[PDB]
Amino acid sequence: DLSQCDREPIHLLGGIQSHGVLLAFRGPDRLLEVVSANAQALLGRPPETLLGQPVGRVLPAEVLAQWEPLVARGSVRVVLPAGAYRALLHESDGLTVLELEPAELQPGMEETALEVVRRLVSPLAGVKGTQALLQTAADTVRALTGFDRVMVYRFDADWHGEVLAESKRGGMDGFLGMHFPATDIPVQARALYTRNPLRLIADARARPVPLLPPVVPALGRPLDLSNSALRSVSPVHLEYLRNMGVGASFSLSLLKEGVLWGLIACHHLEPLHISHERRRACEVLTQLLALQLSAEERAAEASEDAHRAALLGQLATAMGEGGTLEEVLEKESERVLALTGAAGVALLLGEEPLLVGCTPAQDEVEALVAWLATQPFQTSFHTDRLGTVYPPLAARADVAAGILAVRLAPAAARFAIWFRPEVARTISWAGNPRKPAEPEPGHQRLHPRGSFQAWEETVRDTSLPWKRADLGAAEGFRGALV
Amino acid sequence: DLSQCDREPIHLLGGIQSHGVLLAFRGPDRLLEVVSANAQALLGRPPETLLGQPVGRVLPAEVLAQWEPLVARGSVRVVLPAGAYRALLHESDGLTVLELEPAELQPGMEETALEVVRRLVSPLAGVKGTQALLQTAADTVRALTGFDRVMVYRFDADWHGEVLAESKRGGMDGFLGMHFPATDIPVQARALYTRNPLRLIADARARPVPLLPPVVPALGRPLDLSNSALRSVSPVHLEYLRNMGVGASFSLSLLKEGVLWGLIACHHLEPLHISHERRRACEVLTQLLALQLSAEERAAEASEDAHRAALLGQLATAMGEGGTLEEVLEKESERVLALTGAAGVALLLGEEPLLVGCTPAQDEVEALVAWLATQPFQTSFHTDRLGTVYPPLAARADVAAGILAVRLAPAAARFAIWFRPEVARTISWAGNPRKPAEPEPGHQRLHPRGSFQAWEETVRDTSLPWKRADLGAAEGFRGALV
Ligand SMILES: C/C=C1/C(Cc2[nH]c(Cc3[nH]c(CC4=NC(=O)C(CC)=C4C)c(C)c3CCC(=O)O)c(CCC(=O)O)c2C)=NC(=O)[C@H]1C
Ligand SMILES: C/C=C1/C(Cc2[nH]c(Cc3[nH]c(CC4=NC(=O)C(CC)=C4C)c(C)c3CCC(=O)O)c(CCC(=O)O)c2C)=NC(=O)[C@H]1C
């Protein structure tokens, strides 16, 4: 449901954060076309007096002197009388956009950032699970930014999320283990954060600084700030932060193999500015974690296939040793079950269903057998909640919350079906997920929820999900039965 | 081992390079027990007069001021009248070993290294090959060090190596594409390079600085310099370098999943010193490259499996279709051959052999079968030079240089044998591989070979090697079974 939440154009809000200045120029003269309203504190003259002026008569010599590596490199450090600033350049709406924000002051920041990069490559990290890998990545981002709380947030397939790992101060609330509704990060935010993988909110309490004029005159809408480092965020998100009692927020996108896997979210209790250069140090760490995860996930998957493949191998040996099919599938039953991590399996070699291990009754299997043949899968069907899709067995969550069926034949209904029971899980939501926002009367003004306290839910009638190795092994068991 | 090359104890040569100073202290009084003979170059006083003195009365006050940071984190920067020095600390033979070496002088070194870490950790690292990945790794190690020539050197299974990639300055002799004898890096050097992954030879023409006394008086042999950053290398190697025309050399071990995969080898035409901290920066790059290679390689492997599994899946559908075995094997010829990347296949199903694709003659298959029937393999057998193990077919490298046989049976002779033709290869060696060293008469004193000029050989009678995916596909084709 395209929520109110999803429709907010958060790149077109017309404001920037007060700790920096934004300037936009167009054309060969580089005429000032847009400028933030706080520009006087760095430019000297009041902003309105500088609209339409050539860049050489609006910027101080220190900035103009760096224009070429600014254009080439996209960012440079400059010393203004007001202090050290980072200048960032990008293009947007056919304007040249220049942002200035206080520069990194710690001389050894990069030296410290190289140390934490070493912790995250190491010999082999993640030796005691991917859980150790996430925790280490949380600890390093926290050690490098100084934030009170750093959390590793993973998106589930429904785009709801859970905090898998956490690194925070002593005497500090936490959210380790909790789940958050998908609307906490609406769809347009996720699309932006897929392209722009960093965002700092340096002071959740502060008021945004408007742009001058409020629309780009050629366009009739505000300047697109998709790529702006100073962009002020959705006001409903600030209210969300304030409802958490956090004063500053900084999060980096975790793109793994091109997809938005999750976020590293940082919270501070007080306002706090992280330099551009320090933000990029952290961006190196998150691309490093993403690499380590792909490398360990692909090894976990290879090891898993190796286990299943050896099961098929022992089955093959067992077949060619005594023309006793129903007999070997009886003596070798737990290998047949282990193939897909299952607890029962019906075999439709034709006559009567051969029922091995823990299964539903002969009547009930022949009843979903007949139902299965008339479905739009070609070789294999699988679900982890049979009952929501075939209610004749909704009451049998104890043996068939999940099934995995391969078709052993072109036409005709020759099947091998693996069964799984339900596995109850208690997920703990940060706030009541039935009430993920508070609309005003009239439903034109949304507010974040006011509470984040643990609200517990138990999931029934769904099995362990069928993993890729399971499917692979089933496909190969199908190859072994003509 | 075999060579006199393997005998040389390169950790007990008792010399350091002239650009640093080594001190070793024993016991609670930190008494000076070993010292390099150049020690006066930084210590003011003759070394011999300092043996047996407490650390408090031998080290300059600048160093002593940093004793506790040094002892704590094991590495520190100290400013001496001679200039800025990195102090490094380790333990060996129950001594505390203190090494001094010129410190890094570029203040933005770490910032510079974080930029090249970005280049190498970027997602989109692979998107023109694992080849493009090595090239980038050479280019960035070269950017960060300044060496004339950087090469990526991979060890083959017999521990000879070849240069896979190369970043060099304009107008430099290359080595890209050449092969080097295994004895070029003998057995005990590979061992030491597996636990000590960095080494710098700052001036190939310099004489080493001896240690005083020439033995550790407790042990009766020289101090162990395994972990010494200043260790002077084997004289046979310094000679190898000079014959190669190089004045400085620096190499890093490429350790992949525990094993010594290869080296990044750097050559400089002049003498040149890299600071310790800049050496540790490059080490971050090599561990990064190792990470990227494991992930890409494991991706390639998974993709191969998937293609193979699709072939098995398409085969199984052709079964349980119409006809008999040999019927569907007739249509599915190309699939059965592609399962293992093969040019022919023989099927011993009990009758006469069934010969598909490009096979040797029937009588020859039956000879090969009767011989395979005795061999000591469990389910699978493979080789890539059949003729060396079975000379009846040694003439037939046009259809049968490589074979992969699986046993479709137990104590029976039922096989599927896949055949591969030879693939001729032109190895280019750096110098004549038949004379990889020039010994003096009597064979006491050895010397590197004199020339590294390209020297070609062509490898006949060897098929392309059998990969894991071929093996897996064969095991799974054996899934069939009468
Ligand atoms: C109706 C819309 C809603 C929104 C909307 C929302 N929520 C967000 C952003 C958001 N929401 C969240 C959610 C979030 N922060 C956390 O720490 C956790 C768990 C621990 C979560 C789920 C994050 C991390 C962000 C990125 C900004 C940041 O790092 O602080 C946006 C885009 C902000 C912008 O870029 O302008 C928008 C439009 N949140 C709600 O709870 C509801 C009421
Ligand atoms: C009989 C002994 C021999 C040796 C012995 C040898 N050769 C080596 C070292 C060696 N040999 C090589 C070989 C080598 N350098 C290159 O550039 C290339 C190809 C491009 C190669 C094969 C390397 C990279 C190293 C590591 C030191 C360095 O980066 O320069 C040792 C150990 C050195 C030490 O750490 O003490 C030893 C004992 N080389 C030969 O050609 C023969 C003659």
XYZ file of N, CA and C in Angstrom, chain A residues 115-206:
276
model
N 44.266 1.628 11.004
C 44.336 0.577 12.013
C 43.064 -0.250 12.041
N 41.898 0.407 11.988
C 40.647 -0.343 12.073
C 40.401 -1.124 10.789
N 40.859 -0.617 9.643
C 40.765 -1.407 8.417
C 41.514 -2.723 8.582
N 42.658 -2.679 9.281
C 43.437 -3.885 9.543
C 42.669 -4.864 10.412
N 41.922 -4.360 11.405
C 41.131 -5.257 12.250
C 40.075 -5.990 11.439
N 39.552 -5.341 10.406
C 38.425 -5.880 9.674
C 38.828 -6.753 8.490
N 40.067 -6.659 8.005
C 40.574 -7.657 7.067
C 41.208 -8.792 7.873
N 42.197 -8.455 8.721
C 42.899 -9.392 9.601
C 43.483 -10.560 8.808
N 44.051 -11.582 9.474
C 44.122 -12.902 8.830
C 42.745 -13.349 8.341
N 41.958 -13.986 9.211
C 40.568 -14.321 8.911
C 39.704 -13.829 10.060
N 38.885 -12.821 9.779
C 37.821 -12.429 10.682
C 36.656 -13.420 10.552
N 35.611 -13.197 11.349
C 34.437 -14.054 11.302
C 34.731 -15.515 11.536
N 35.794 -15.828 12.288
C 36.141 -17.220 12.565
C 35.122 -17.867 13.508
N 34.548 -17.103 14.443
C 33.456 -17.609 15.283
C 32.124 -17.009 14.830
N 31.844 -17.284 13.563
C 30.576 -16.965 12.955
C 30.597 -15.621 12.251
N 29.581 -15.409 11.414
C 29.345 -14.070 10.900
C 28.888 -13.126 12.007
N 28.497 -13.677 13.155
C 28.149 -12.856 14.307
C 29.360 -12.106 14.836
N 30.525 -12.740 14.807
C 31.728 -12.042 15.220
C 32.103 -10.960 14.211
N 31.805 -11.192 12.934
C 32.147 -10.236 11.888
C 31.340 -8.948 12.026
N 30.023 -9.068 12.241
C 29.169 -7.889 12.405
C 29.557 -7.096 13.646
N 29.719 -7.790 14.775
C 30.130 -7.148 16.022
C 31.425 -6.357 15.859
N 32.410 -6.951 15.196
C 33.665 -6.261 14.940
C 33.437 -5.019 14.086
N 32.589 -5.134 13.060
C 32.303 -3.979 12.221
C 31.562 -2.898 13.008
N 30.688 -3.292 13.932
C 30.051 -2.300 14.794
C 31.076 -1.625 15.697
N 31.956 -2.421 16.313
C 32.953 -1.885 17.234
C 33.900 -0.925 16.542
N 34.281 -1.226 15.303
C 35.225 -0.354 14.610
C 34.563 0.949 14.174
N 33.336 0.889 13.657
C 32.675 2.140 13.293
C 32.491 3.010 14.526
N 32.211 2.389 15.670
C 32.043 3.184 16.876
C 33.363 3.781 17.336
N 34.449 3.002 17.256
C 35.749 3.491 17.704
C 36.230 4.647 16.843
N 35.796 4.694 15.591
C 36.251 5.674 14.617
C 35.382 6.928 14.555
N 34.091 6.826 14.900
C 33.198 7.980 14.882
C 32.891 8.535 16.267
N 33.053 7.744 17.324
C 32.735 8.217 18.653
C 31.266 8.208 19.018
N 30.402 7.596 18.204
C 28.966 7.601 18.479
C 28.624 6.722 19.689
N 27.583 7.141 20.418
C 27.176 6.417 21.614
C 26.646 5.036 21.286
N 26.081 4.849 20.102
C 25.503 3.551 19.792
C 25.601 3.313 18.303
N 26.080 2.129 17.946
C 26.233 1.704 16.563
C 25.570 0.343 16.442
N 24.708 0.182 15.438
C 23.933 -1.041 15.272
C 23.982 -1.527 13.830
N 24.043 -2.844 13.666
C 24.006 -3.468 12.351
C 22.566 -3.902 12.084
N 21.979 -3.318 11.058
C 20.576 -3.468 10.732
C 20.478 -4.223 9.411
N 19.733 -5.333 9.403
C 19.553 -6.144 8.203
C 18.101 -6.124 7.761
N 17.890 -5.904 6.469
C 16.551 -5.923 5.903
C 16.144 -7.358 5.632
N 14.955 -7.719 6.095
C 14.360 -8.990 5.743
C 13.701 -8.860 4.380
N 13.167 -9.975 3.874
C 12.645 -9.974 2.508
C 11.411 -9.091 2.345
N 10.678 -8.808 3.427
C 9.559 -7.872 3.397
C 9.981 -6.432 3.682
N 11.282 -6.143 3.655
C 11.898 -4.855 3.969
C 11.661 -4.403 5.406
N 11.049 -5.219 6.260
C 11.219 -4.955 7.678
C 12.644 -5.334 8.082
N 13.082 -4.840 9.234
C 14.458 -4.996 9.624
C 14.608 -5.518 11.038
N 15.821 -5.990 11.328
C 16.201 -6.381 12.673
C 17.655 -6.017 12.938
N 17.923 -5.626 14.184
C 19.254 -5.224 14.616
C 20.015 -6.496 14.965
N 20.914 -6.945 14.079
C 21.684 -8.168 14.321
C 22.866 -7.970 15.266
N 23.382 -6.751 15.399
C 24.586 -6.556 16.193
C 24.614 -5.123 16.695
N 25.407 -4.898 17.737
C 25.313 -3.637 18.453
C 26.576 -3.371 19.268
N 27.016 -2.123 19.227
C 28.193 -1.666 19.946
C 27.842 -0.280 20.472
N 27.910 -0.106 21.792
C 27.400 1.110 22.408
C 28.105 1.325 23.741
N 27.943 2.528 24.290
C 28.545 2.890 25.570
C 27.998 2.045 26.704
N 28.723 2.059 27.821
C 28.131 1.615 29.065
C 26.945 2.485 29.432
N 26.019 1.905 30.189
C 24.879 2.674 30.661
C 24.095 3.319 29.537
N 23.740 2.498 28.559
C 23.153 2.965 27.319
C 22.100 1.967 26.873
N 20.907 2.468 26.578
C 19.870 1.629 26.006
C 20.353 0.982 24.713
N 19.647 -0.074 24.309
C 20.046 -0.831 23.141
C 18.827 -1.389 22.447
N 19.048 -1.874 21.228
C 17.988 -2.511 20.458
C 18.408 -3.863 19.894
N 19.537 -4.418 20.343
C 19.978 -5.716 19.853
C 18.811 -6.687 19.864
N 18.618 -7.377 18.745
C 17.590 -8.395 18.644
C 16.207 -7.922 18.240
N 15.983 -6.620 18.087
C 14.617 -6.179 17.859
C 14.316 -6.027 16.374
N 13.039 -5.909 16.079
C 12.550 -5.843 14.717
C 11.840 -4.526 14.528
N 11.969 -3.974 13.336
C 11.379 -2.676 13.121
C 10.522 -2.771 11.874
N 9.366 -2.112 11.856
C 8.496 -2.170 10.674
C 9.189 -1.638 9.424
N 8.734 -2.135 8.269
C 9.251 -1.674 6.986
C 9.033 -0.174 6.773
N 7.970 0.402 7.343
C 7.695 1.823 7.144
C 8.630 2.740 7.936
N 9.469 2.195 8.821
C 10.467 3.022 9.487
C 11.494 3.574 8.499
N 11.674 2.909 7.361
C 12.505 3.378 6.259
C 11.668 3.219 5.000
N 10.901 4.229 4.599
C 9.948 4.046 3.499
C 10.667 3.848 2.175
N 9.880 3.510 1.150
C 10.471 2.949 -0.065
C 11.329 3.991 -0.790
N 10.919 5.269 -0.784
C 11.722 6.256 -1.505
C 13.044 6.515 -0.794
N 13.062 6.426 0.541
C 14.318 6.517 1.280
C 15.271 5.392 0.895
N 14.752 4.157 0.789
C 15.608 3.028 0.434
C 16.153 3.186 -0.975
N 15.346 3.734 -1.893
C 15.833 3.959 -3.256
C 16.952 4.996 -3.268
N 16.780 6.078 -2.507
C 17.847 7.056 -2.352
C 19.074 6.420 -1.705
N 18.888 5.718 -0.580
C 20.053 5.175 0.126
C 20.761 4.085 -0.665
N 20.142 3.579 -1.726
C 20.841 2.675 -2.615
C 21.813 3.422 -3.507
N 21.486 4.662 -3.891
C 22.378 5.493 -4.697
C 23.333 6.326 -3.847
N 22.886 6.809 -2.692
C 23.695 7.705 -1.858
C 23.912 7.047 -0.508
N 25.056 6.399 -0.295
C 25.184 5.433 0.807
C 25.600 6.010 2.154
N 25.574 7.329 2.341
C 25.872 7.969 3.617
C 24.878 9.086 3.880
N 24.632 9.344 5.158
C 23.828 10.488 5.559
C 24.145 10.787 7.015
N 24.444 12.040 7.299
C 24.619 12.532 8.654
C 23.461 13.471 8.994
N 22.830 13.244 10.130
C 21.977 14.241 10.746
C 22.747 14.689 11.980
N 23.338 15.888 11.923
C 24.273 16.292 12.970
C 23.573 16.856 14.191
N 22.306 17.258 14.063
C 21.579 17.848 15.192
C 20.073 17.695 14.925
N 19.486 16.627 15.475
C 18.061 16.357 15.269
C 17.154 17.461 15.807
N 17.672 18.362 16.630
C 16.853 19.412 17.218
C 16.831 20.673 16.377
N 17.819 20.855 15.504
C 18.042 22.127 14.833
C 17.013 22.363 13.729
